[PDB]
Structures are given as C-alpha cells and as structure tokens.
Amino acid sequence: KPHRYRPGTVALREIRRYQKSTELLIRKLPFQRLVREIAQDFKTDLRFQSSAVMALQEASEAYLVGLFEDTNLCAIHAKRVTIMPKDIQLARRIRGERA
Amino acid sequence: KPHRYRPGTVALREIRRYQKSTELLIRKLPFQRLVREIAQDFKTDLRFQSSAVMALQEASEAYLVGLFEDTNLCAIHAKRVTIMPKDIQLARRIRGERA
Amino acid sequence: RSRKESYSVYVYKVLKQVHPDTGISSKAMGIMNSFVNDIFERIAGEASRLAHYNKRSTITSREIQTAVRLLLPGELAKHAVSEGTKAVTKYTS
Amino acid sequence: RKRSRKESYSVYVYKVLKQVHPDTGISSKAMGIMNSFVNDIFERIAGEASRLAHYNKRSTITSREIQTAVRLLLPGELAKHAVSEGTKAVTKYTS
Amino acid sequence: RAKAKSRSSRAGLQFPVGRVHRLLRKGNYAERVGAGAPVYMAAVLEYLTAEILELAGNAARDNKKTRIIPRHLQLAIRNDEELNKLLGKVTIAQGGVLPNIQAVLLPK
Amino acid sequence: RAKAKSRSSRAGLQFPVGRVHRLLRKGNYAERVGAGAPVYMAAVLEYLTAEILELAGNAARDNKKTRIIPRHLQLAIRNDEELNKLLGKVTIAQGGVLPNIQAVLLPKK
Amino acid sequence: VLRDNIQGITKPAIRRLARRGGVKRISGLIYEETRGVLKVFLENVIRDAVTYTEHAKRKTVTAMDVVYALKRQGRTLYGFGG
Amino acid sequence: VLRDNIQGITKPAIRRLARRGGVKRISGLIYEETRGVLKVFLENVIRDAVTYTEHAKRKTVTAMDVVYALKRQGRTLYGFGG
DNA sequence: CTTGTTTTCCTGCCTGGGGGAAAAGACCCTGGCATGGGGAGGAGCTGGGCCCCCCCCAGAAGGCAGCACAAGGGGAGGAAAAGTCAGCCTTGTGCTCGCCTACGGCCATACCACCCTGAAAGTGCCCGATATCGTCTGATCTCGG
DNA sequence: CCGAGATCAGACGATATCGGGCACTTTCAGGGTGGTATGGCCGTAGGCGAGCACAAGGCTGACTTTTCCTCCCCTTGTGCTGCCTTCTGGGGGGGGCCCAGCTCCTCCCCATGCCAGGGTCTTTTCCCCCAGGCAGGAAAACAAG
C-alpha cells in the first residue's frame, strides 16, 4: 500500500506553515460579498472603498486568529486537544463578549 | 451523636448570604496597612485619605469577585467544582492581564 | 470659602417626576452624579472626535446625535435620539 | 487644478532609521504602519496631558504634563528612557 | 419657543442647558459649540437619568424600601440588559453583585 | 543651545518640533501649549520610533532581508516584552502572528 | 449579494485560521459557531463604519471609517492610515 | 505596616470573596495565588494614583487620584466623587 | 534500529517592479514686535490625617473527624484526519461608464465676545420620620431512622 | 416517608440619624448689541468605484479508511469541609497635635496674535538594484520491517 501520514503530523505542518506566513486565509471575494450583504441591513446603496473592505478582512482575520488562541487554551485546560463550540463560548464570555 | 451538615450545604448557604449582602468582605485595617505598604516603594511619607483607601478597597473587592466569577467558569469547564490556581491563571490570561 | 456644583438639584427633580414616592440616599446621589458626569464626557469626547475627523470646528446637534448613536445600545440610542430631537425641535420653535 | 497635499512622518522616520540602522531600507506598507504608530502615541500622550491639565485646573500643557503622561502611559524601562531623553531634549533646547 | 425664559424651560427639560453649554465650551472639545448641542445633551442625559431612576425605584419598591440606595441602582443596571451593556466596565460602590448560583453547584 | 535656526536642530531631534507644536495647538487639547511641550513630545516619539526601528531592523537582518516589511515590525513588537505591553490592543496589517506551538500539541515518545 | 453569503467563509478557511491560531484538532461543529462569531463581529464594526459614513454625508464607506470604527472598540489597526 | 501585611488578607476573607463570586469549593493554594493577584493589581493602582499625586505636587493621596487611576485602567468607579 | 518516501531548504539564474535620489514649488515655521494673563510665590487659616490609649467581643487560627471529589486507569465507539478525484468559481486582465467626492468661490447668519442684572442654586440650620436593632415566635430546610 | 433540630423569615416596640424643607446669598446664566468667520450652496471635474466577458487552475466539495481521541465507569486516597475552642486584634470612643491643602494679592515672565520671508516638506520622474519566481540538487524528518 502507498505511503500515508499518521493523523496529527499534517496538522502541525499546517500550523507551522500558516504561522510563518502573513497571507490572508479567507478568500477575498466571499468576504467582500459577506461585508456587502451585512452593510445593506444598515443602509442601502452603499459603496465600499476597496481599502475599507481590505481593512475589514484584516481586522476580522486578526480577531479570529486571536480568538482561536483563547479557544485552544480552553481546550488544553479541559484536558483535550480538540476544540469545541463550548470552548469558543467560554473564551468569549471570559474576554467579555457574552457576559 | 450531634446533628451535622453534609458538605456543600453550608457553602451554598454562605454563597446565598454573601451574594445578597453589600458589606466589605476584607477587614479594613489589614487592607489599609497593605496599601500604606505598597505605596512606600513608589513614594515615601505619603498621606492617605480615608476616602482614597475606601475607594481602593471597594475597587479591589470588585476586581477579586469578578475574577472568581470567571475562575468558577474555568473550573466548571474542566468538569470540576473546586477552583484551582490553574483556573485563575487561565482566566487572567484570557482576560489579558497575563497574555 | 468655595462652592461646588453637581447634578443633585436636577436628578432629584426627575426622581420626583418618575417615582414621586421614593427618596434617595447621599451615596446613591453621588453615584448618580458620577453617572451623569461619565456619560457627558463620553458623548462630548465622541462628538469632539467626530468634528475633528470631518474637519469641522463647531459641535452641532448632528454631532451629538451621531455620538449618541455610536455610544448607546440599540433601544437606548433609539429613545435618546428621539428625546434629543424633540427637545431641539421645541427649543428652536 | 492642483491636488491638496498630505503630511506624514515619512521624512523623519527614515532619518531615524538611517541613524539606527544605516544600510536597511523600509517598505511602503511598513512606513505607513510607522506613520500610524507615531500618530497613535501622539494622540494618547496629548489626550492624557490634556486630561491631566484639566484635573488640576490648568490652561497650559507643559513639559511637566508631557512627562507625567509619559510616566502614566508607558511600561517601566520605556518610560524611564523616554523621560530621560525628553528631559535631555528640553534642557538642550533651553541651554 | 417665543417666550423669553430660561433655556431649560424653553426646551422642556429638567437638566441645566446653561451649565451643560458652559461645560461643553470650557471643556475644550471644539473651537465653537453650537446652540442646539447643549439642548440635545441635556435631553439625552435627562432620559438616561429617568431610565435608571425608574428601574432603581422599582427595585426599591420590590424590597419594601422607600429610599434608593447603591444596591438598588446596581440591581437595576445589572438586571437591565441594555444598561448593563452601557455600564459594563463600571463598578458601583457598595452595590454588590446579582444573586447567581451555577446550576451545576446545586445538590442533585 | 543658542541659535537662530530650526527648533528641531536647536534641541537635537530629527522630529518636527514645529509640526508637533502645531498639532498640539490645533488639536483642542488645552487653550495654551508651553514652549517645552512640543520639544518633549518630539523626543518621546523619536525615542519610540528609534526603539521599534532598531528591533525591526534586527528582525529583518535575522531573516536575510535588506528591507523592513510589516512582518518584521510585528515580530519586533511581539518579541519585545515592554513593547507588546504598549501595543497590546494593536493590529499590524499583514503582520501575521508570532510562531508558537503548545507543549501538549507535540509528538511524544 | 442579498442572501446566504455567510457560507463563503468555507470550512477550509476556518481550518486555516485555526491552524494559524495554533489549533491542532477541530470538532465538526466549530465552523457554524465561528461563522456566527464572525457575523457578529462584522455586524458590530460595519454598524459603526456606516454611522461614520452617514455622518460625513457620504455614500462610500472609507478605509478611514473602518479604521475609526475599529479604534472605537479598542481594536486599533495600523497600516491603512489614521 | 512596613513588612509583611499581604497576610492581613486572611483566608476567611478570600473565602468570603470567593463565595460572593459563586464559588462552592476552594483548593488550598487559591489563597496564595489570590494574594499575588491582589498585590499585582494594587501595585498598578497605587502607582497610577501616586503619579497623579506627585503631578499635583501633593503628599496626600486623595480619592480623586485613585478614581482617575482606576478610570485610566478601564475600571471606572462610581460613588467616590466625579 | 535501516531503507524508502515524501517535504523542505539551498543555490544559481532571470526578471520586474518599486524604493531612493533628483527637480520644482508652495506653504507653513520662524523671526520680530506688542500685549494680556495665568501662575509662581509669599503669606495666612484651619481641616484633616496621624498618633496614642483603653476596652471588648467577634472573628480568625488550629485541630479533629470524616467524607466526597479529583484523578488515574481501562474499555468502547465514533468522528476527525489524511488521501484521492471531479468540478467550480476566484482571480487576474482588460474594457466601459458614470456617480460621487473633493475643490473653488461667494456670502449670510450663527456664534463669540462684552456689558450688567437678577434669579437659581449652593450652603447652613432644623425637624421629623424611616431604617435598623432586638426579641419573639412561625415557617421551612436539612438530615438521620 | 418519618420525626427532631437548626436557620431563615416576619412583626412589632423604639431610637437615633439622615433625608427633606426653609432662608441668605452670591455667582453664574440670560438679554441686548456688535462683528466676523465658518459653513452652506452652486458649479466643475475627474478619479475611482461599479459592471461585464473570458479563461484556467488552483481550490473546494465529496467519499473512504481508520486511527486515535473523547467519553463513560470504577476505584482510592487525599484534600477539602464542617464544627469547637482560644486567643488575638480589629472596631470603636475620646483626646491631642501639627502638617499640609486651600485661598488671596502681586506682578512678571511666558504664551499669544499678526506680518514678512524663505527654507523645509510635498509631489512627479526615473532608474537601478533587491526581492520574487523557478528549476535542479541535497538534506531532513517520517513512518512501517
């Protein structure tokens, strides 16, 4: 049979790859569509400076990357390796987003 | 043999009694003596308004209660009821006071 | 001899307008004056930042309205904006 | 017609860069970030000094207020060195 | 309004339009302050006043008390979801905390 | 030192004392701005800029690069303990994150 | 761009974000929670950016509007100006 | 007051503070850990307040100095002036 | 412990695109001069923070019994991960249009500054009336049998 | 499901302290008038933001295997809780004292305001060097015998 990697080594390879890089991980167009759909609920016929959408993408990705670091710590505290939604809820509650 | 309360009931009664109260839960003189000790390393021969030491006390006692209110969640997340130093450390790190 | 000013002659006139049965303690009055002093600074600072962003040198009502919208939650902002607009509309004419 | 001119710290950041590290350049995005950093800590210190001068009912922002704002805003060694360099700059500007 | 009286009465408020204007002018927020800014601010502040005083009076009446203490203000602020979001980083002195026990810490 | 020249060269700074004074004057901070307040701020900002531009230069030299990019500044800021405290709530665009793996999430014997 | 655009932050993208965050294993329900979290955060930031745009009497949301909105919530962003 | 008043925060006091936070069971190291946490926080506050005190050329630490030091850290305090 | 198998780093070559220096200009910092005004300084008053003493009893400290919960260990299953394979939709390029934001010029009306007066509110004095303490039962919760 | 025993809850006598109201004042808000300068309105332009073909190919969506991680149950002993007794020290009252924080009057040095002038900072060109891409080779972990 061909060569197959043991579960959990490609995960660390991806961790190192995406930590050594500075690229944006969400594709630009699906996020731009999300931003435009969200802003319509606030005001219709809204134009977006491309730099504004890019700034929103960078801020959102920074937020999610920082939140996953608080989630991984909760998952390690609970004597686990896998992160679940309860970890995200606890991290948000403690940091002050759910009270 | 005399009557005895099973463990946990007195703790819950104390929780109910101290959550319905408003008074200060730290003795005033031992806290004033600690404030007048911390201030010396910054500036000597400092005077201290009673209002100032009261403000410090009612700020620290709301900091510590709010911190234990997060340590309790950090203990419950690990399928526990006892609160341990690791819970306090995790709560503080997620809050941002330890990073 | 000096005198100090506080929102104690005005909070106790709204308290007797909304609940004309209950009183208020000195410590509660101090807390409720600190609340007004904090919210005033919040709104005024946000309006100042807005006016500086838009290269204006005058703090109008349309800056206070935007500061209120930014600073307060949904229903609180909706009611505060309407109260301010009613007061401004009656004051002007 | 003409286009309105913009102002930034991109002439002084580069001057400091060539003093502390003579042979390395700086990219445009990095210069843009270093332009927002200076503005951010300028606004922080200026606001702290303004509130400081309002607390003691003073109308003038002075090196005293700037020094106290620096001591209140920066961590230990950063505040020590910033206060020392600012005091040296003020002493040399006066002498 | 055409009647020439105090500016708070002219606006229908109970908060001081004059001293709010003076505080806006001498607080160094902008070089100029409009005429309707104090009126708007003394109507937002007076509404935020009656939103907390009403709930604190409700809390005081709920405990057979005819006076409002810091505990009543804390109860009102922390029980109202919007006011707890506004004053989320504010410590009410001598206010205590809401009565709250996690359901996992109760006997089964 | 007594001179008739630019106030930046009179104080020994590379940052604009005149611009810093003008921004303080038109920033609505106080009615009056003293003579030594712009000199103090133009030196505090210069020291902080020098600190970051030295740490980021070190980081860029550690990556075999002649040019400073946002990743180098992010590395400098998050690797300096006293600078990470000053910029703890700040996002650096295209700065990435500090590489780190928890000791639990690693292969064992 | 009117309906069902939240399913554009795909499972691989959320996996890469967690990998950069140091996450070694992910449960299958994490994605529908991270999407809600991202929607809430974006709805909080854009709500203030649009308020700034309306106050400026403009019809285009600018990078300065986004940067100021982010700065308001204690999430200062360096790089796009300000 | 010169030496070792951090133990003036007795274990019953820490237990009462824990009970007011909804804590049912406490380990035997929470007391030392909490004393450390209390000292770290008081050191920040009674330093940011003494900074104001020496800026006002005063030797007494007034309640307003403490209130401003708490406000500048995000922990606004109502009731002690302001 | 080896050998085979992927993935990563290294190095040389090619290339392109963007950063650093030069050039013209324009605009704001500086120098000079006159002027008001805030605060630095020297008194004075007195409020309050510090120090001391005496008393008590309320709470902390130590100990003992004992029990229930944290933690280690074993087993089961199910559910992410890793690897293929097919299609789709992102992105880069290029082309087109027109809408909106910014600049310029003009002016008008709104805000600052100043001069006075009066009335609002800030402080002090005083009185009553509500919150609390204390004792007595009444109800409810907890735990053994 | 049963009966004791502790603990909280309600209620009335009462007592002091603190909220609420009345008078003096004093100090700040408001009316009237002058002046100017900021912001609103109209007009112009062009920059950039939106919309549309067209690949192609990298990326995403789906199916299979399976391993290992999460979850549950058991058991032990250890650390936590609960109650009793001791003794200390925190809380309270009363007095004395001296320093420090607030106020007031002088005036004088510092900050401000305005005009003339240039030297420093801004924007546009451009070119050459540093960083990106890519192909071939060596090294390095990784896993199955």
PDB file of C-alpha atoms in Angstrom, chain H residues 16-72:
ATOM      1  CA  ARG H  16     -15.873  35.297  51.529  1.00  0.00           C
ATOM      2  CA  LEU H  17     -14.738  36.938  48.288  1.00  0.00           C
ATOM      3  CA  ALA H  18     -14.940  33.549  46.553  1.00  0.00           C
ATOM      4  CA  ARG H  19     -18.428  32.908  47.959  1.00  0.00           C
ATOM      5  CA  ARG H  20     -19.647  36.266  46.655  1.00  0.00           C
ATOM      6  CA  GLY H  21     -18.477  35.088  43.220  1.00  0.00           C
ATOM      7  CA  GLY H  22     -20.483  31.852  43.315  1.00  0.00           C
ATOM      8  CA  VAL H  23     -17.600  29.524  44.236  1.00  0.00           C
ATOM      9  CA  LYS H  24     -18.648  26.378  46.100  1.00  0.00           C
ATOM     10  CA  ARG H  25     -15.274  24.667  46.657  1.00  0.00           C
ATOM     11  CA  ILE H  26     -11.796  26.176  47.007  1.00  0.00           C
ATOM     12  CA  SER H  27      -8.397  24.497  46.844  1.00  0.00           C
ATOM     13  CA  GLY H  28      -5.587  25.153  49.302  1.00  0.00           C
ATOM     14  CA  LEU H  29      -3.425  27.297  47.010  1.00  0.00           C
ATOM     15  CA  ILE H  30      -6.076  29.797  45.890  1.00  0.00           C
ATOM     16  CA  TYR H  31      -5.185  31.918  48.924  1.00  0.00           C
ATOM     17  CA  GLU H  32      -1.542  32.469  47.957  1.00  0.00           C
ATOM     18  CA  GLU H  33      -2.446  32.804  44.280  1.00  0.00           C
ATOM     19  CA  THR H  34      -5.110  35.434  45.098  1.00  0.00           C
ATOM     20  CA  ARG H  35      -2.736  37.335  47.394  1.00  0.00           C
ATOM     21  CA  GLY H  36      -0.315  37.530  44.475  1.00  0.00           C
ATOM     22  CA  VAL H  37      -3.089  38.651  42.128  1.00  0.00           C
ATOM     23  CA  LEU H  38      -4.290  41.217  44.673  1.00  0.00           C
ATOM     24  CA  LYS H  39      -0.791  42.639  45.107  1.00  0.00           C
ATOM     25  CA  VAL H  40      -0.142  42.866  41.351  1.00  0.00           C
ATOM     26  CA  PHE H  41      -3.346  44.885  40.850  1.00  0.00           C
ATOM     27  CA  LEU H  42      -2.876  47.139  43.870  1.00  0.00           C
ATOM     28  CA  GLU H  43       0.681  47.854  42.713  1.00  0.00           C
ATOM     29  CA  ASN H  44      -0.660  49.190  39.408  1.00  0.00           C
ATOM     30  CA  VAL H  45      -3.414  51.271  41.014  1.00  0.00           C
ATOM     31  CA  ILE H  46      -1.363  52.790  43.875  1.00  0.00           C
ATOM     32  CA  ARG H  47       1.269  53.659  41.296  1.00  0.00           C
ATOM     33  CA  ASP H  48      -1.006  55.318  38.740  1.00  0.00           C
ATOM     34  CA  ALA H  49      -2.540  57.244  41.668  1.00  0.00           C
ATOM     35  CA  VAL H  50       0.771  58.343  43.192  1.00  0.00           C
ATOM     36  CA  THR H  51       1.776  59.562  39.736  1.00  0.00           C
ATOM     37  CA  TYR H  52      -1.181  61.969  39.850  1.00  0.00           C
ATOM     38  CA  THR H  53      -0.343  62.834  43.463  1.00  0.00           C
ATOM     39  CA  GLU H  54       3.229  63.913  42.619  1.00  0.00           C
ATOM     40  CA  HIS H  55       1.972  65.675  39.489  1.00  0.00           C
ATOM     41  CA  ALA H  56      -0.251  67.839  41.713  1.00  0.00           C
ATOM     42  CA  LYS H  57       2.788  68.494  43.957  1.00  0.00           C
ATOM     43  CA  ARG H  58       0.867  66.870  46.817  1.00  0.00           C
ATOM     44  CA  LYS H  59       1.836  64.410  49.534  1.00  0.00           C
ATOM     45  CA  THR H  60      -1.675  63.138  50.319  1.00  0.00           C
ATOM     46  CA  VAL H  61      -3.339  60.607  48.006  1.00  0.00           C
ATOM     47  CA  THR H  62      -6.839  61.978  47.523  1.00  0.00           C
ATOM     48  CA  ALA H  63      -9.826  59.897  46.460  1.00  0.00           C
ATOM     49  CA  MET H  64      -9.828  61.656  43.082  1.00  0.00           C
ATOM     50  CA  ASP H  65      -6.317  60.379  42.354  1.00  0.00           C
ATOM     51  CA  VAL H  66      -7.481  56.803  42.956  1.00  0.00           C
ATOM     52  CA  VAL H  67     -10.634  57.382  40.905  1.00  0.00           C
ATOM     53  CA  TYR H  68      -8.628  58.701  37.941  1.00  0.00           C
ATOM     54  CA  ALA H  69      -6.101  55.863  38.226  1.00  0.00           C
ATOM     55  CA  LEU H  70      -8.958  53.348  38.170  1.00  0.00           C
ATOM     56  CA  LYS H  71     -10.651  55.127  35.258  1.00  0.00           C
ATOM     57  CA  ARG H  72      -7.463  55.130  33.186  1.00  0.00           C
TER      58      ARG H  72
END
